Ligand binder design. Structure first.
Ligand code: CE3
Ligand code: CE3
Length: 263
């Protein structure tokens, strides 16, 4: 079948010139709205949530892990290091690296999270451990953001990512203290105002993690607390056919607005 919201998302996609994937979970009744919900999309920076969560999980059995210093060398710097660049020849704790990766989308910080987990496969193993059989991280930063059409590397589906984000932020995939830390980090994101959040009623609160890459790949995943109602989880992925396509955060905002209006 095809619902009204699904029809509106289809119209948005057609006018956009790209491919749109959406997954909503409304925890008020556990109902879902999917659009290309089982198609694979490049995650880009949205994968940073899985890496941070995996390190939080490790910290459950090490009350001091988040305070562990990690050396940042000049050679470690990649293509987007707004926080790490200030700490070259110094150190950052895993908590600092998690906050930098999530709230500033720092790619060098993400690489340190991946390294702590033993490589991209370590992040994938954590995803499997919490019931996500779809997610796959294959590369480090920044090549995990190449976003080449058809490439299965570093992809997931909207359905899978929404279910996992729910488990992490609203469920029991993490311990209570760790879940609160993850939510606090997401709510403090600095990069998300033009994406999902731009399509929501002003009064609503949210935590999100953006992603972007080649092929005008423009992503966002969010946990939303609408004013006076049970939280939602929303994933919006978008990618385009030309390598040099422009970013389209307005498409994500439009998708979120359609979703919000349809509740
Ligand atoms: C080889 O890697 N290529 C990247 C890339 O590093 N994407 C990563 C990603 O996701 N990040 C986000 C992100 O979270 O969206 C921002 C956020 O940007 C700002 C200013 O907030 C900065 S770029 C980084 C890329 C990005 S766009 C494009 N053509 N390529
Ligand atoms: C000359 O371009 N250099 C880029 C680059 O491709 N940036 C692109 C661009 O502008 N985009 C926008 C944008 O148009 O605003 C956003 C905004 O947020 C999202 C989600 O797209 C994310 S980055 C992407 C780059 C990537 S990493 C690095 N150090 N430089």
């Amino acid at each position: 079948q095809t619902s009204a919201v699904q029809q509106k998302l289809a119209a948005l996609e057609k006018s956009s010139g790209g491919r749109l994937g959406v997954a909503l979970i409304d925890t008020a009744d556990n109902t879902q709205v999917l659009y290309r919900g089982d198609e694979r999309f490049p995650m880009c920076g949205t994968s940073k949530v899985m890496a941070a969560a995996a390190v939080l999980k490790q910290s459950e059995t090490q009350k001091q892990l988040l305070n562990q210093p990690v050396e940042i060398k000049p050679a470690d710097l990649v293509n987007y290091n707004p926080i790490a660049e200030k700490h070259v020849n110094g150190t950052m704790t895993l908590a600092e690296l998690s906050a930098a990766a999530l709230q500033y989308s720092d790619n060098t910080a993400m690489n340190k999270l991946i390294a702590q987990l033993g490589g991209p496969g370590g992040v994938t193993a954590f995803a499997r451990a919490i019931g996500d059989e779809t997610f796959r991280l294959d590369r480090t930063e920044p090549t995990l953001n190449t976003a080449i059409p058809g490439d299965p590397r570093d992809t997931t589906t909207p359905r899978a990512m929404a279910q996992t984000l729910r488990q992490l932020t609203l469920g029991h995939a993490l311990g209570e203290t760790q879940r609160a830390q993850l939510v606090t980090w997401l709510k403090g994101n600095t990069t998300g105002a033009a994406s999902i959040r731009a399509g929501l009623p002003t009064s609503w609160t949210a935590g999100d993690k953006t992603g972007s890459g080649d092929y005008g790949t423009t992503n966002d995943i969010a946990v939303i607390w609408p004013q006076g109602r049970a939280p939602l989880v929303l994933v919006t992925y978008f990618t385009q056919p030309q390598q040099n396509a422009e970013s389209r955060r307005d498409v994500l905002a439009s998708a979120a607005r359609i979703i919000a209006e349809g509740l």
